Structure formats: C-alpha cells, structure tokens
Write a protein that binds this DNA or RNA. Structure first.
Ligand SMILES: Nc1ncnc2c1ncn2[C@@H]1O[C@H](COP(=O)(O)CP(=O)(O)OP(=O)(O)O)[C@@H](O)[C@H]1O
Length: 435
RNA sequence: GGCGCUGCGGGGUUCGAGUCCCCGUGCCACC
C-alpha cells in the first residue's frame, strides 16, 4: 500500500499518547520546583528533553552541572545527596549515579562538570550536555521521524547500544534523522550502506573509510556507532531493502518467539546429525552490561576450544534467565577417535628425537616427510566431555564473574533433557528452524 | 566495575613456544 499510509499508522505504535505525556509533564514540572529550592545548577537532557522518547520507554534524565573547581572525587557523592532529596525512591546504580522515580515517572540524576566547550572532554559522561545542545535546535520538527526510526529498530531487536543488543543508540538515531531529514530517507539510503561507510553529519557528507563510522558532531575522533556490531549493521541494511521492496506495518511490530514441540525439535536434531548441547551454570549477581560481554567471552572461548579439538562447531548462542545462564553449541562431530597424531622433531635432530621416542606409547612412532610422528590418545572423544574438561580447568578465562560461577558449579546438558530447559527460542534461532 | 584491541613480563602444553593455552587506549558504562 501507499508507503505514506503505513508510516502514518506507524506513528500510533510509536508516539506516546496524551496520558503518558502529562504523566511526564507533571513529573518534569514537579522535579524542577524541588531542584530550584536547593539552588543547584542542573539541566534537563536526553530524549525526554527533546520530546523524542519512544512510546513505552519514558525516562526523564537530569544532569547536575558542577563547577570544575572541585575536581576528582570532590563532587561525586556531593551529587548523591541531592539525588535522594528530590527523588521519591533512591537506588544507586553503577562512575556513580542515582536512579529513582518522581510521581511514577522513571528518572535519572547524574553529576558531571560544567566545562567550557567540548575540548575539555576527559570524562566520557561530560559529553551528553554537549550532545543535547547540538541536537536541541536541529531535531525540532523531526521528533516523529526519530520515533519512527526507533520503533522500527526496536521492533527488530536492534535498538540501543547496550551490550545485550549491540544496536543503534538513541543519539545515533537522532543524528541519522538530522542527516537524511526523515525516517523514510534514512531507510532508502541505508540500503547502500557498506561496512566502510562514513557518515559525517557536521561536514554533511558521506565518505569511504576503514569501518562503519558515524562522526560525532561534538568530537570528530569518536564513532557514535562504536558499539553497533557488524552483523546488526548488516541486518539493518537487509531490513531497509526488504521494507522498501514490500512495505508493511509488521516491521514496526515485535516478533513472537518461535513456539515448537520438544519432539519436533529432537527429530530436527536427529536429521541434522549434529551434536547439540548446553553449559548451564548459576547466573552471577551483576548488571547486564557486565554479564553479556562475559557470556560472549565464555561462549567464544569454548567455541574456539571446539575448533582446536576438531569437533567442528557450527554456531553458538547464549541465554540468561532469572537464576541460570546457558551457553549453547552445535557441532558436526558427535564422536572422534581415541587415537590422534602428535608431531615429533625432524629426523636429523638426534637429541630431540631421542627424547620424543623415550616416552611410552601403545603403538610405534613412525617417520613421514622427514619428521617423526607418534600415535597418542585423546582425553575425550565427544564435544560434551571435551567442554566438561575445558570448563573445569580453564574456568578462570571464561570471564570474571561468569568463570567464577562455572568454577563453583556447571553441568553439560544435551539430548532430550536440553529441550526441557528454557532455551528453545535460541536453539531454534541458531539452527535456523522455521515454521 | 565488566568486556574489547595493543604493549611489557611470569607460567602451562610440548622433543622444542618470537608463534599455541593460561596468568599479572577504546566500548557499554545515566557517556
Ligand atoms: N552512546 C551515546 N553516545 C553519545 N551520547 C549518548 C549516548 N548514549 C546516550 N547519550 C546521550 O544521553 C542521552 C540520554 O541517554 P539515554 O536515556 O540512555 C537514551 P535516550 O536518548 O533517552 O533514548 P530513549 O528515551 O528513546 O530510549 C541521550 O539523549 C544522548 O544525548
């Protein structure tokens, strides 16, 4: 249908209604009256300040501007005192900051330096006010275009730079809209993005570079898309193409996970002929920004072990539930032989040859292309037993918190027992199951 | 604090680690 009509109806799923605005407006006005009675310098930044927040994800952010005379730690806890005061519910989160609510509305209170211009950028937090200031006037009249882009990305699991997502940050979306002027223009052009595209908003041009790079108008040296993974960039370009090819309101609706019977899943695994198994361990008590990168690390390490040991892994995946974490793996080798070849020294190296042949072995060493070789015995013949051996000895390298939890307890789950665990969605995804 | 790319060292696997495995500036961090 008329693309213009799809986007008009898309505003509904994306723009917050009057009931949610006044909720926030009555929180904004009441938050200021409290901040003024104390007599502290503050500024309302963020997506709320620019009226670009997505429907459902309301959050009023306030930044406490302090003079740079009191440097170092001489202003951190001085802001925590003001936080709890104007807030109804204090609960510090981790550089510190205070999270809370004001008349039901979610709020953030953050301390940072006032600074001159964005040349004194040492602390990374001291950048948001400059970002806000750069966007405050340029985004005016395009708020809905920003909201459309966000909902589009949100509905396809690529909104937010947080490590659980590794997608497009809100700031990035606003810059993209300021650059192309609208959501529709962003999608049309994204179709021709490459892994080497450089979007320079301030200079108003597009170049070719070393990697995908969105120049921050505040700092030319920094990539606003720094944490946008290569695979999500790819997913987006493919999405934009699909959208223009055959527009649909569905691109703005979340996808329900693939519901599937454990028996069908077992029969699928049987047909693939692969080894499918999970590492299950207790979830560390840490925030998502720490957990997911560790889960990626543990996943990667084990996946590399599998390659080294010639179990030929296909893909990996991980899920975090309420109490446990799962590291999932699929491998082309269910079983490998006990014997393998170990490489001995060159034949003319008399000293080393003697040491190599001094070891006791079941079978005789042999010469091949000038070198000595010997048959020896693996310490495991299936990837499950391999990973069990590895997770026991190399727990330390599987992430700080993750690795420590694995050291205390883990278990390898495979077969039909695995299909009972809450990982069906992930197993379906990594195997590319469809229905 | 966690992860990532480098640099300098100490161990492990091995007949033999400049190389393989482990150990002692950037990103997300409310940027
Ligand atoms: N990765 C980043 N790079 C540069 N600036 C960022 C940034 N992340 C956040 N900011 C700044 O901090 C402000 C608020 O950050 P957040 O509240 O965490 C996301 P948001 O801008 O509120 O989007 P949202 O309300 O639609 O979810 C942003 O408006 C932006 O100015």
């Amino acid at each position: 249908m008329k693309v213009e009509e799809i986007l008009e109806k898309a505003l509904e799923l994306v723009i917050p209604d009057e009931e949610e605005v006044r909720k926030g407006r009555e929180a904004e006005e009441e938050l200021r009256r409290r901040l003024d009675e104390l007599g502290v310098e503050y500024v309302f930044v963020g997506s709320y300040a620019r009226n670009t927040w997505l429907k459902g994800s309301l959050e009023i952010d306030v930044f406490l501007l302090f003079p740079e005379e009191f440097s170092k730690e001489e202003l951190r806890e001085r802001g925590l005192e003001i936080g709890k005061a104007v807030l109804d519910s204090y609960e510090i989160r981790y550089h510190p900051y205070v999270h809370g609510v004001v008349k039901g509305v979610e709020v953030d209170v953050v301390p940072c330096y006032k600074l001159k211009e964005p040349k004194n950028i040492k602390s990374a937090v001291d950048r948001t006010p400059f970002h806000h200031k750069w966007l405050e006037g340029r985004i005016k009249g395009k708020e809905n275009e920003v909201r459309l882009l966000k909902g589009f990305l949100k509905a396809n699991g690529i909104y937010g730079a947080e490590y659980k997502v590794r997608g497009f940050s809100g700031y990035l979306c606003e810059l993209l809209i300021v650059f192309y002027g609208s959501f529709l223009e962003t999608v049309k052009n994204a179709r021709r993005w490459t892994r080497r595209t450089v979007i320079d908003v301030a200079k108003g041009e597009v170049r070719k570079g070393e990697e995908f790079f969105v120049v921050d108008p505040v700092d030319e040296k920094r990539n606003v898309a720094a944490n946008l993974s290569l695979d999500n960039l790819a997913r987006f370009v493919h999405l934009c193409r699909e959208f223009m090819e055959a527009p649909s309101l569905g691109f703005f609706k979340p996808k329900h996970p693939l519901e599937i019977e454990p028996e069908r899943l077992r029969k699928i695994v049987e047909e693939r002929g692969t080894a499918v198994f999970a590492v299950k361990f207790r979830k560390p008590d840490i925030v998502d920004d720490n957990l997911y990168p560790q889960l990626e690390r543990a996943s990667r390490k084990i996946f590399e072990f599998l390659e080294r040991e010639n179990f030929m892994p296909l893909r990996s995946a991980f899920k975090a539930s309420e109490e446990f974490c799962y590291l999932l793996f699929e491998c082309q080798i269910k079983e490998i032989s006990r014997v393998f070849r170990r490489m001995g020294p060159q034949f003319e190296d008399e000293r080393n040859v003697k040491k190599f042949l001094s070891r006791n072995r079941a079978f005789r060493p042999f010469i091949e292309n000038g070198r000595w070789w010997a048959f020896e015995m693996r310490k495991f013949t299936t990837p499950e037993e391999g990973v069990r051996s590895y997770a026991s000895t190399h727990w330390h390298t599987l992430g700080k918190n993750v690795g420590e939890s694995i050291r205390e307890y883990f278990e390898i789950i495979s077969g039909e027992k695995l299909f009972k665990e809450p990982v069906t969605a992930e197993l379906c995804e990594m195997m590319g199951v469809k229905d």
